[PDB]
């Protein structure tokens, strides 16, 4: 890999610089290089990895949605034929997006997840596995769509099981996992009732645990609780 000759600490340092410069593709490449050094990641380093790829894939997903919308309109009744270009370019962006997802899933499989033993790291990485299978599911249309969806479900479910056993209901990783698994239910699995039930129960159980927290932890948890509330308000 092109980062093989750079020190682990230098890659982390440059990932932080890239974040400041909003150079998220660079940030992702630096963190990929850091992961490939083979050592486990600290809490801060795990969040640098997730921030980097979340921003890269987020831009690709937004672009894919724009192009998919244009493509769908071109296939409506009365739309003038414009040739293969819209499909080709949507496919180009789709292929690049799938490549990013495959890269992240490859890092998780080689070998972040198998070495992650603490709840905070294991749940974090399994949430990421669910997230990137979900992003693959968003663009999937063929023979493997059901298997992609079930891979997302399975990763989220393992993360949920661990988080419920090993973390308090206000833990920000547990809350963000539940938020995203709820979105999976609503958008991917065609299970809006499950999505709503999970968001409500997650919110209520966190509310009841807020009294145990410091001011700073309270701020962290209530921020994500508001995102659960935002979705419940949108969906009901």
């Amino acid at each position: 890999g092109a980062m093989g000759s750079m020190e682990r600490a230098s890659l982390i340092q440059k990932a932080k610089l890239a974040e400041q410069a909003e150079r998220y593709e660079d940030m992702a490449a630096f963190m990929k290089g850091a992961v490939e050094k083979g050592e486990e990641l600290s809490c801060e380093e795990r969040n640098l990895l997730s921030v980097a790829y979340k921003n890269v894939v987020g831009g690709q997903r937004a672009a894919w949605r724009v192009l998919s919308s244009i493509e769908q309109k071109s296939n409506e009744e009365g739309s003038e034929e414009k040739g293969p270009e819209v499909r080709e370019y949507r496919e180009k962006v789709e292929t690049e997006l799938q490549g990013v997802c495959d890269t992240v899933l490859g890092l998780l499989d080689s070998h972040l997840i198998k070495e992650a033993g603490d709840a905070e790291s294991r749940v974090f990485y399994l949430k990421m596995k669910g997230d990137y299978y979900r992003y693959l599911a968003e663009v999937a249309t063929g023979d493997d769509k059901k298997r992609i969806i079930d891979s997302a479900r399975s990763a989220y479910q393992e993360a949920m099981d661990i988080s419920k056993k090993e973390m308090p209901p206000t833990n920000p990783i547990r809350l963000g996992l539940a938020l995203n698994f709820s979105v999976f239910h609503y958008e991917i699995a065609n299970s809006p009732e499950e999505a709503i039930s999970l968001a409500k129960t997650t919110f209520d159980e966190a509310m009841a645990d807020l009294h145990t927290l410091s001011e700073d932890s309270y701020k962290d948890s209530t921020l994500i609780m508001q995102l659960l509330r935002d979705n419940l308000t949108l969906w009901t």
Partner: peptide, 7 residues
């Protein structure tokens, strides 16, 4: 309307 929230 607003794009549902994920993290």
């Amino acid at each position: 309307w607003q794009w549902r929230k994920s993290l």
